[PDB]
Design a protein around this motif. Structure first.
Motif, short mmCIF file in Angstrom:
data_model
loop_
_atom_site.label_atom_id
_atom_site.label_comp_id
_atom_site.label_asym_id
_atom_site.label_seq_id
_atom_site.Cartn_x
_atom_site.Cartn_y
_atom_site.Cartn_z
N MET A 267 76.85 47.34 -10.40
CA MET A 267 77.93 46.35 -10.59
C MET A 267 77.68 44.91 -10.52
O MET A 267 78.34 44.31 -10.97
N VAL B 121 96.79 42.95 -17.26
CA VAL B 121 96.26 43.87 -18.34
C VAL B 121 97.35 44.69 -18.68
O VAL B 121 97.67 45.73 -17.95
N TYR C 32 74.60 49.34 -19.65
CA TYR C 32 74.27 48.69 -18.28
C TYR C 32 75.07 47.54 -18.00
O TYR C 32 75.59 46.93 -17.11
N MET C 33 74.90 46.57 -19.16
CA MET C 33 75.65 45.17 -19.09
C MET C 33 77.20 45.26 -19.13
O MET C 33 77.70 44.36 -19.03
N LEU D 249 79.13 47.88 -17.75
CA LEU D 249 79.81 48.34 -16.54
C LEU D 249 80.44 47.11 -15.86
O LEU D 249 79.93 46.30 -15.41
N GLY D 250 81.80 47.45 -15.42
CA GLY D 250 82.78 46.63 -14.75
C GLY D 250 83.10 45.27 -15.42
O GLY D 250 83.98 44.51 -14.82
N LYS D 251 82.43 45.01 -16.65
CA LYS D 251 83.01 44.04 -17.36
C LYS D 251 84.39 43.99 -17.97
O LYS D 251 84.83 45.06 -18.05
N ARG D 252 84.79 42.87 -18.09
CA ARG D 252 85.95 42.67 -18.90
C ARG D 252 85.78 42.30 -20.42
O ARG D 252 84.60 41.74 -20.65
N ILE E 79 92.90 41.97 -23.07
CA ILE E 79 91.81 42.46 -22.26
C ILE E 79 91.43 43.83 -21.92
O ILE E 79 92.56 44.41 -21.58
N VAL F 34 89.05 46.79 -19.50
CA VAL F 34 88.02 46.85 -18.28
C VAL F 34 87.21 47.92 -18.65
O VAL F 34 87.62 49.17 -19.01
N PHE G 172 84.26 54.07 -20.89
CA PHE G 172 85.55 53.93 -21.49
C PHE G 172 86.18 52.39 -21.33
O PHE G 172 85.56 51.85 -20.45
N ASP H 56 89.86 50.51 -20.40
CA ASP H 56 91.18 50.56 -20.05
C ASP H 56 91.76 49.10 -20.24
O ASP H 56 91.44 48.27 -19.62
N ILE H 57 92.69 49.36 -21.12
CA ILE H 57 93.83 48.18 -21.57
C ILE H 57 94.87 48.14 -21.12
O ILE H 57 95.98 47.41 -21.40
N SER I 268 83.91 36.33 -21.32
CA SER I 268 82.78 35.35 -20.40
C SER I 268 82.65 34.28 -21.23
O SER I 268 82.22 34.56 -22.40
N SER J 288 73.06 39.65 -22.17
CA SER J 288 73.66 39.65 -21.00
C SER J 288 75.23 38.95 -21.35
O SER J 288 75.28 38.02 -22.28
N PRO J 289 76.34 38.88 -20.62
CA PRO J 289 77.44 38.09 -20.52
C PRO J 289 77.10 36.52 -20.04
O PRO J 289 78.01 35.65 -20.07
N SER J 290 75.98 35.95 -19.57
CA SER J 290 75.16 35.01 -18.89
C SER J 290 74.08 34.68 -19.45
O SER J 290 73.10 34.38 -18.61
#
Lengths: 335, 335
Positions: A93, A162, B92-93, B95-98, B106, B108, B132, B134-135, B157, B312-314
């Motif tokens: 995470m 959301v 992996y990048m 996982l848990g990101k928006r 948006i 998840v 997956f 989730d919107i 991001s 990555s997002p960063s």
């Protein structure tokens, strides 16, 4: 909606409060409760206890104020930070996420590994000792000034809507904190009501929850989150789900008095057409010590908000479940 | 700093432009270049070509406008989205990101798996078909209206300063786009200068870069990102690093004319005390076809911005490297 809790939820979930550094959350709770509590105290462990009412029966509502996060354990010669987990945070995470530190410093989580096979090997069996945080420093000295060893960080992720769901960090358990605050704002209690905004108790340490935080209560109700198992393929009968209402349980092998609290909550929900779900009882082993532990202390139950993606930066709740929880508690604890 | 590029970088990196849907990025580029270009065209593949100047030698500067992301490939009965990767995005990048979608929706990212062993098994060998999005939808019908199959998304991001570094999504290659825009704003070209803001070319498809996007150029210089291998344990001699200046190379087995461009860039950097790094040449195999491919087409070189955390997002850059890159190009392409 029939409460107006969005801003309270935004404020509490966005607040900085990793385990060990919850000052901002306590302060926010007290500001929100100004004029709605008769008093408060903070115990030696950092549990914040507030009260209202004068009724004969004493009832605790208990939600955790701390959130998962990271703690800085090393600073290297180029300014990169080593971290360990605070609470149940998976290193998966944390990959590529931004972390916000107490002083407002932002860092980026990276993983060691140069080649595809190195990174594949690392990421397939991910360990915290392969992560680091980059706060933009160019030396150990610059980094130690911004985030010295012992500094805490949390997700750099805040609250968003959301499509009718609410998403933030720290639903676990700022959503429970919001429920308790809202109950205190709305209720005319028939009981003496205690709101406990507690620090979680590390396994291996003495906590205060068993002794009721020094409150001689008749009942103690934990307001927590529970995993909402209503996402793809994790599709089972009897799963907790968003929009199914508060999830109600007691511990396995609970006492008659604890089971009575559960039965009474169920009755209130039924009488007032409040949605609710029956959650499997909290597992506590099968031995003699576990049996006696439920028959002492304060009769207790748990009311939980269904939450998707627990321990991610994007924990998700259905606002109707939160409102239903408030409604249930106000009816149960009122005249 | 001696340029004022922060806002340009913020705007370009934050813009929505996954491969296949780069309209906003092209529009921003054209707005920034209004009054600084003599003309433009968009080719049938979506490459945006602009020009300024009237000098005898024709020079292309080429940066990619598309970013990595996701595309929606299925919507399930409960409203959850299945996705595939756009570009080099590791699951992996995600996982848990928006994820932000074209229309502003948006979502998840979650992963399938209920038990610890299920999730451990999944997360240890992560595949896109276990993710997956989730919107917040509650049915296939609600979800299909917000994000129908074929919808693109990018990281949710944006841009932040991290102690003197810049962090955003899509440094690859919005930073190259920003370099080209800045060159066009500042330069009085001694050449006819072409700025190409290109769509990346999928392996297996015909692209336009080999034919110079239909421009009969004398030289073509790609402005790209390169991985900055200056993070913990990925510590090797000769690594590209932040604050080392633009990274200069050509393809392996490059022609004499391509090597001349590199030598001339090196000379400019040396004469004007501009930091630079010598990057290993682009690997292209060792066979006869690869040899002849470098000796036809347009003489070419690559100038790259060192970037940490690519994909990555960063993604992280040092603003001094960007300014040095602009300075190098202005001196090379000017009087």
């Amino acid at each position: 909606h029939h409460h107006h809790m969005k801003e309270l939820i935004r404020k509490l979930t966005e607040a900085f409060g990793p385990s060990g550094r919850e000052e901002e959350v306590r302060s926010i709770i007290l500001e929100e409760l100004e004029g709605h509590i008769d008093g408060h105290r903070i115990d030696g462990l950092g549990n914040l206890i507030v009260w209202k009412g004068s009724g004969e029966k004493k009832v605790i509502l208990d939600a955790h104020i701390d959130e998962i996060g990271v703690v800085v354990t090393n600073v290297d010669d180029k300014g990169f930070l080593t971290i360990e987990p605070v609470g149940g945070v998976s290193p998966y995470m944390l990959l590529g996420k931004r972390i916000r530190f107490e002083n407002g410093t932002i860092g980026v989580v990276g993983m060691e590994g140069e080649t595809t096979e190195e990174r594949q090997e690392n990421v397939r069996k991910l360990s915290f000792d392969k992560l680091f945080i980059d706060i933009g420093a160019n030396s150990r000295e610059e980094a130690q000034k911004m985030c010295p060893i012992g500094s805490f960080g949390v997700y750099d992720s805040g609250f968003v809507e959301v499509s009718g769901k609410y998403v933030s960090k720290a639903m676990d358990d700022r959503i429970g904190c919001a429920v308790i605050v809202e109950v205190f704002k709305r209720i005319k209690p028939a009981v003496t009501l205690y709101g406990v905004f507690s620090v979680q108790e590390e396994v291996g340490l003495v906590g205060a929850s068993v002794a009721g935080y020094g409150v001689p209560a008749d009942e103690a109700i934990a307001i927590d989150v529970t995993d909402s198992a209503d996402t793809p393929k994790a599709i089972k009968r009897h799963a907790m789900r968003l929009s199914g209402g508060p999830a109600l349980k007691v511990k396995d092998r609970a006492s008659i008095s604890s089971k009575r609290i559960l039965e009474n909550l169920i009755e209130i929900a039924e009488k007032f057409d409040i949605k609710y779900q029956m959650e499997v009882l909290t597992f506590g082993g099968t031995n003699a010590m576990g049996y006696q532990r439920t028959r002492e202390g304060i009769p207790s139950a748990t009311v939980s908000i269904p939450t998707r993606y627990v321990h991610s930066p994007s924990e998700m709740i259905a606002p109707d479940d939160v409102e239903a929880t408030v409604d249930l508690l106000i009816r149960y604890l009122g005249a």
